[PDB]
Structures are given as structure tokens and as C-alpha cells.
């Protein structure tokens, strides 16, 4: 097949997939029991199977996004009830997978490490959705270590911060995390946070920032 340099699709993917999906919709989040995990898996594989692992689009996962009806706690959404707490996020967490043109299965030999691959594209899409589903007061944890804690070039300032619905979400709250080691100055007064700030305000939303240890 196509030779790659990156790790292969996680051995036993489908099982690990359905297994996690079942534990989620049936016991952890019982209000989602009516979600068909087989259907969800198939709709997932369709996004990349029989395709080049470096030619995956955001549209390949669109159906997946339409299929899953996610339960969303309002004031608990937190960017960085996290994304890994949603059905899809809890499933693909730490898993690898890709396809191959010359097959209708998943590549267990090797996968890419080419910015439009199965893995990278999946997380971007479910992140955008997650944002769109946010309700009330949304949070976001920012690294107080970095110079520019907030940077558009991230999935956050790129699409996440712009996919937040003002009608449902009325306030964005940025958490600038710091270490006891280091005189981490108040980054909430820097530009990155002043920009992230204007963006949110310019979108009829209240912005709050805090510096914690």
C-alpha cells in the first residue's frame, strides 16, 4: 500500500471504538442510549476508508457531526465538560487510524504523521461542533507560561472562538494558568488576551480573564 512514517491504526480499533461508544451512551451518559454505535462507527469509517490518509476534508466528517445528537451541559463547556467528554471525543481519544486507496479497510501497517489526515481532521471538526453546541458561560484554559497565551493560529482563535453562538453563549471566560515556580506576570493584560478579548466583545459577548496558580 502507501508507505508511511507514522504509527499504524490502533490494533483492534473497531472494538475499542464500539466498546467505548457503548459504555458512553448506555451507562455513563444513559440519556444517549438511543444512539446507534454501529451506525456511528460506519458513518465514521466512511470519512476516510478507501481514501488517501493525507487528502481528508472537513466534509468527510460532516455526516458524523449530523448523526450524533450530543447532550450538552450549559455552563460547563471548557476549551483548552471538555471535548474529550463528548461521545466522539471520549471515543477517538488517544486512538490512531487511517485508510488507504487500494483498500476498503484501515491501515494497520502504518499511517501518516500532510496536514489533512484522518486524525487531525476529525478533531478539528468535532471541536468546531463542540463550540457551536456551547451554551451559557463557556470557559477556556490558557497556558500562562507562553508569551502569547492566546493565538489565533490555534483551533481556538481560528474557528472555535468564532463558532461560539452568542444567542446561546453570553459570556466567555479565559483561564490563564500559571506555575508557582516563575514570577508569571498577569498575562490577562497582554495583547493575546486583549485581542481574544476584542474578538469576543466585537461579537456581543462579555469577556472575563483571570490569572490562577
UniProtKB/Swiss-Prot annotation:
Highest rank taxon of the organism: Eukaryota
GO function terms (MF aspect): hydrolase activity, acting on glycosyl bonds; identical protein binding; NAD+ nucleosidase activity, cyclic ADP-ribose generating; phosphorus-oxygen lyase activity; transferase activity
Membrane topology term: Single-pass type II membrane protein
Residues in compartment: Extracellular: 1-213
Subcellular localization, as worded in the UniProt entry: Membrane
Any single GO CC term annotated in Swiss-Prot or TrEMBL for this entry: plasma membrane
GO BP of this protein: B cell proliferation; B cell receptor signaling pathway; negative regulation of apoptotic process; negative regulation of DNA-templated transcription; positive regulation of B cell proliferation; positive regulation of DNA-templated transcription; response to xenobiotic stimulus
Disruption phenotype: Loss of cADPR and NAADP synthesis.
EC number: 3.2.2.-, 3.2.2.6, 2.4.99.20
Keyword field: Disulfide bond, Glycoprotein, Hydrolase, Membrane, NAD, NADP, Signal-anchor, Transferase, Transmembrane, Transmembrane helix
Subunit structure of this chain's protein: Homodimer.
Family, similarity comment: Belongs to the ADP-ribosyl cyclase family.
Function noted in UniProt: Synthesizes the second messengers cyclic ADP-ribose (cADPR) and nicotinate-adenine dinucleotide phosphate (NAADP), the former a second messenger for glucose-induced insulin secretion, the latter a Ca(2+) mobilizer. Also has cADPR hydrolase activity.
The name this protein goes by in its record: ADP-ribosyl cyclase/cyclic ADP-ribose hydrolase 1
Amino acid at each position: 500500500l502507501l508507505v508511511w512514517t507514522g504509527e499504524p491504526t490502533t490494533k483492534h480499533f473497531s472494538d475499542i471504538f464500539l466498546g467505548r461508544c457503548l459504555i458512553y451512551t448506555q451507562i455513563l451518559r444513559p440519556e444517549m442510549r438511543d444512539q446507534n454505535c454501529q451506525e456511528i462507527l460506519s458513518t465514521f469509517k466512511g470519512a476516510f476508508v478507501s481514501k488517501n490518509p493525507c487528502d481528508i476534508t472537513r466534509e468527510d466528517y460532516a455526516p458524523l457531526v449530523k448523526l450524533v445528537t450530543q447532550t450538552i451541559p450549559c455552563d460547563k463547556t471548557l476549551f483548552w465538560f471538555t471535548l474529550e467528554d463528548t461521545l466522539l471525543g471520549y471515543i477517538a481519544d488517544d486512538l490512531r487510524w487511517c485508510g488507504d486507496p487500494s483498500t476498503s479497510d484501515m491501515n494497520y501497517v502504518s499511517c501518516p504523521h500532510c496536514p489533512n489526515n484522518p486524525i487531525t481532521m476529525f478533531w478539528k471538526v468535532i471541536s468546531q461542533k463542540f463550540a457551536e453546541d456551547a451554551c451559557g458561560v463557556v470557559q477556556v484554559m490558557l497556558d500562562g507560561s507562553l508569551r502569547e497565551p492566546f493565538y489565533k493560529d490555534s483551533t481556538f482563535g481560528s474557528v472555535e472562538v468564532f463558532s461560539l453562538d452568542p444567542n446561546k453563549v453570553h459570556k466567555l471566560q479565559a483561564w490563564v494558568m500559571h506555575d508557582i515556580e516563575g514570577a508569571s506576570s498577569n498575562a490577562c493584560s497582554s495583547s493575546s488576551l486583549n485581542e481574544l478579548k476584542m474578538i469576543v466583545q466585537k461579537r456581543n459577548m462579555i469577556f472575563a480573564c483571570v490569572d490562577n496558580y
